[PDB]
Structure 1
Amino acid sequence: VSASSRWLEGIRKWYYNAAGFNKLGLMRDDTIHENDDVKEAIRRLPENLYNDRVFRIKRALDLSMRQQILPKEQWTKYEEDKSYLEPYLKEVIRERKEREEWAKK
């Protein structure tokens, strides 16, 4: 909407490229630490996203073993990073918080 919230994105694009998981062809949600909430969200993914997530992670563990990265052409662009897991994950948390609010009635 403005120029101030636009360099805010510029420093988030900066941190994104510095974090460097896009150099392994990975997306932000591929790097989330699996807890009980996350393991449930992954369980709920449709077959296409689950299989894609499996291969991207497998491709990255392969690269990490060789201490290599993908060509710059194949890095995950900050603009094209689909937060595919947070919708499922946010509903998992929402359900858990409901149980927790009932548990103290």
Structure 2
Amino acid sequence: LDGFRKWYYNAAGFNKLGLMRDDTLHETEDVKEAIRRLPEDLYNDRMFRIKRALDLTMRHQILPKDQWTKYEEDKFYLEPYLKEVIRERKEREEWAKK
């Protein structure tokens, strides 16, 4: 399962643009709240990675293979911050039903 997940990570292809997994999340309301709660350096790296991926997609290029994002290396930075947004979101919801 670990090797097949690495093979699917190579087949997804966002590592060839230098992106992380959390860069590829669709910005819903909860995702934008999690992005807003990021520290400044992580937010700046995320915006630069997104801009570089957009530029590479503009020129129809990819990064060189040494510059790709290694599956093992990818960091799920937004995840911790996101869970909270969802948790808080759900809590408010249940309370609504009260």
Query: Is the aligned partner of 1:70 residue 2:70?
Result: no
Equivalent residue in structure 1 for 2:12, among 4, 13, 19: 19
Partner Cα separation in structure 1 for residue 85 and residue 2 of structure 2 = 28
Q: Percent identity?
A: 89
Separation in 1 of the partners of 2:72 and 2:95? 40
Compute the TM-score of the two structures, normalised by the length of structure 1: 0.92
Match of 2:28 among 22, 25, 35: 35
Please state which structure has a larger fraction of its residues in helix. 1
- Structure 1 gaps of 5+ residues are 1-7
User: Which whole-Å deviations, capped at 9, do the CAs of 1:18-73 have from their partners, x for residues lacking one?
Assistant: 00000001100000000000000000000010000000000000000010000000
Aligned partner of residue 23 in structure 1, secondary structure: coil
Normalised TM-score (structure 2): 0.99
Whole-angstrom CA distance in 2 between matches of 1:96 and 1:51: 26
1:9 Cα deviation from its structure 2 partner: 0.8
Q: Which structure 1 residue ranges, 4+ long, deviate > 6 Å from structure 2?
A: none
Aligned length: 98
Q: Where in structure 2 are the equivalents of 1:48-87 lying within 5 Å?
A: 48-87=41-80
- Bigger Rg, structure 1 or 2: 1
